[PDB]
Amino acid sequence: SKDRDLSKVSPYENIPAKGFTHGVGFDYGVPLSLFPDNAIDPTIANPESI
Amino acid sequence: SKDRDLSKVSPYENIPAKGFTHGVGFDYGVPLSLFPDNAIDPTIANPESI
Amino acid sequence: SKDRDLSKVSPYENIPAKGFTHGVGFDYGVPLSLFPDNAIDPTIANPESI
Amino acid sequence: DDATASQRGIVTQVADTVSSISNVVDGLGVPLLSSISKPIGWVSNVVSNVASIFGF
Amino acid sequence: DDATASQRGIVTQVADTVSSISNVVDGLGVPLLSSISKPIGWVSNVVSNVASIFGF
Amino acid sequence: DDATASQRGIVTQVADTVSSISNVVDGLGVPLLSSISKPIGWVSNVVSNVASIFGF
Amino acid sequence: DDATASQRGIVTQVADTVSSISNVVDGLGVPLLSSISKPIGWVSNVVSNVASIFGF
Amino acid sequence: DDATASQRGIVTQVADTVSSISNVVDGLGVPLLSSISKPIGWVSNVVSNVASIFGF
Amino acid sequence: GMDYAKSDSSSLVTTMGEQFRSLRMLTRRSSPTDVLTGTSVTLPGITIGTDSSLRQSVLNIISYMYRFTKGSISYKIIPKIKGDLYITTSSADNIELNSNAYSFDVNRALHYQNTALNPVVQVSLPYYCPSENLVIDSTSFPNLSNLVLTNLERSSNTYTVLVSAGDDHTFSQLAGCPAFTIGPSRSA
Amino acid sequence: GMDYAKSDSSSLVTTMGEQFRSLRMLTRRSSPTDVLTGTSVTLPGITIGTDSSLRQSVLNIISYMYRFTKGSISYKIIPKIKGDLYITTSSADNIELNSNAYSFDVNRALHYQNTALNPVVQVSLPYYCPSENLVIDSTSFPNLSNLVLTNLERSSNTYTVLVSAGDDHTFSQLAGCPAFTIGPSRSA
Q1: Buried/exposed code over C10-43 (b: 16+ C-beta within 10 A; e: otherwise)
Q2: Please, are residues I165 and I29 in contact by the beta-carbon 8 Å criterion?
Q3: Interchain proximity A30–B18, CB inside 8 Å
Q4: Which DSSP string corresponds to E1-56?
Q5: How many interchain CB pairs under 8 A, G with H?
Q6: Other CB atoms within 10 Å distance of the CB of residue G40
Q7: What distance in Å separates the CA atoms of residue J114 and residue A28, rounded to the nearest whole number?
Q8: Which residue from D5, D45, H18, J117 puts its CA 20 to 30 A from E37's CA?
Q9: Distance between CA I179 and CA I54 in Å, rounded?
Q10: Alpha carbon J64 to chain centroid distance?
């Protein structure tokens, strides 16, 4: 049952936070809350449509 | 036979336990048992259906 | 909800910059700018077509 | 569906099912334990006698 | 579409939509908040009562 | 099927087969060794003379 | 095609195109800059006003 | 086929071919060098003049 | 009935990031217990419960409203002095006094880890009981498996432990509530 | 109208690598605040704002043109002395003076991290408020959750912190601008 693994060794780099100055793409941080994905919709309570 | 690898270097982060306070998603720990996936069904021995 | 992970342990190597002397393939570095992918087209302002 | 749940790799989906709610009071109710049940998935192997059980 | 956005693995795409621009002045305008809205995706589960809510 | 077993990446499945049980006593029996056999998979290459054997 | 180029993960392919060679001297020539041009791919978003531009 | 060989990710397969054995003595023979040949795969690009050669 | 009640009218997404309609989800969440100094460390078994003092795990608090438990339980462990350690199960019969024997000598399931690389030990303890149910703090089964951990060389150390319900786990039979304190202690 | 204006004629791709048509994108970007020496560290809450001095976050600068806020906010933290630390939420009611109690004793959401491996702490703080809106620097809700962080052993340390708007976040109601300085200080 303990069959041999084969696969491939693969290269990597240890960069803890690749891009936080960027204005786009991925938070990374862990929310301090039950349920990994908190959310709410900002668009609903707004004083105006635009 | 020893053909060249190509691939791509890829970024990573060393975070040992990304979210244990969360109420959902993935145990990570190793069971101390033969067979990686122990289980039993709780639903069967219950005093009531609800 | 916290179901067991299974997967597979996989080998890796820590090589920070696998090939910069090569004339082809992947920048790796982070641009110092808003938007991860800056670009401009060189071909347009050229004095001649070739 | 732990195998698929780990293979797909995303934390959220955790194998969907739809429970049969009952005893609704005011738009809220109590799920049956009978339908919250989820597959175990080694049992099929032990009953069907797959080769991997014997190590071969 | 955060699940797909993380599964696909590329930073750029970040779930496409096309907003309804209005109040154009000189080729530039203001998007409606109503159409900038993006799916939340846990709400469907809470309303439909998926099993994972109960931990089973 | 070690190649697929490693490529799929999940620990559990370990290449399925169904053994031919015999000598049942009380709902339990002894599998034949003949059917517990699993593919080796380099032998096909050595017999068919694939190029990789010669290093080219 | 940087998105696909990074998603596919292999160094070599780097998005193919075929240039229109001219001024051949002895089996060798000079590519036009007009056809060496490659897609930028954020511009479509800025012109079409995708939601992600506004952060939502 | 190094690109596929690295993309598939498994050590064993190393791009299959079947050589034309000759000079068999007792069930064993000598492969032709002509058929052990394997694709190089940058040459097509240099001859077809792909854009990536020019860095664009 | 004579009700004035008229049913609500309010959106779910507008105000907080999540909603939960079960106590299990709260219990799958892992919480701190108490620091375990010294060599002869003693983690609670799957029978769990009956802690004194006042600091106590969330699972340990939910524990008092019920009567039966079943399923595996999980542990996270954070050693104070870094260095490798071992994890093993045991039982009261299983122990020996040869004074040359040691915990590895029984051939139970084992787990090694160097903490210099992976500081957070993660171990799940399975459910080996003859009976489908367990009254909480049962003593009817003296030989139930119990966890033990050792550095080699048997040096002293402290550990920050935090337990959680396994995915397999549940409670059953609803007894009524314990008296319980709520606010911060008054006066000194 | 009597306009001389004739509309432009210029390509977008020819001169700079990007273009942006919103202030949110500028705010999702994370910027430094102020160094936090000592044990009793105090990060700003989701009410945010009202810093003195002159150095201030970009979010903190955009903050003055508006009146309402809503949504979670993000933090990056870089400790000066490496070693593990813990992150926890709290509130003014939630605190205790038993002088044997400590911050772990409330069972709030928790986060551990050894900084020797991952120097950059990354934590997102959610949005638990009764109200759909929050006037900036509101004091109408005294018990709103507030972040705290501790090394065990309670030793002194400094931290480099940098905040950012969460993806969930927005501002609303446009008040007019504050007076603001622009150039480098003249003379000494």
Answers
A1: eeeeeeeebeeeeeebbebeebeebbbbebbbee
A2: no
A3: yes
A4: -HHHHHHH--SS-----B--EE--SSS--EE-HHHH-----SHHHHHHTBGGGGT-
A5: 36
A6: 16
A7: 17
A8: D5
A9: 13
A10: 14
Q: What burial class does residue I169 get, using C-beta atoms within 10 Å of its C-beta: 0-12 exposed, 13-18 middle, 19+ buried?
A: buried
First CA to last CA across chain D, in angstroms? 24
Q: What is the resolution of this structure in A?
A: 3.3
User: What is the residue range of D1's domain?
Assistant: 1-56
Which amino acid is present at I53? S
Q: Which of I188, I186, I183, I171 is nearest to I64 (CA)?
A: I171
For Cα atoms I29, I33, I38, give the angle at the middle one, nearest 5 degrees.
140
Spatial separation of the C-alpha atoms in residues J62 and I31, rounded to whole Å: 39
Q: Considering only residues 17 to 46 of chain B, which have any Cβ-Cβ distance to chain C shorter than 8 Å?
A: 23-28, 31, 36-37
Distance from chain centroid for Cα J130: 21
* Angle at the Cα of E41 from the Cα atoms of E37 and E45, rounded to 5 degrees: 140
Q: DSSP code of I137?
A: T
* Chosen from J22, J29, J72, J74 to mutate, greatest number of chain G CBs within 10 A: J22
Helices and strands in chain I: count of H runs, count of E runs: 2, 10
Nearest to E6 by CA among C28, A12, A37, J166: A37
DSSP string, chain C: --PPP------EEE-S-S-SSSSSS---SPPSSSSS-----GGGS-SS--
Interface residues of D toward B, Cβ cutoff 8 Å, are 2, 6, 11-12, 14, 22-23, 30-34, 36-37, 40-42
C-alpha E21: how far from chain center: 18
Q: Where are the domains of chain I?
A: 1-188
Q: Answer whether J157's CB lies under 8 Å from J80's CB.
A: yes
Q: How many domains does chain G have?
A: 1
Q: Where are the alpha helices (DSSP H) in chain I?
A: 24-28, 58-62
**By what method was this entry solved?**
cryo-EM
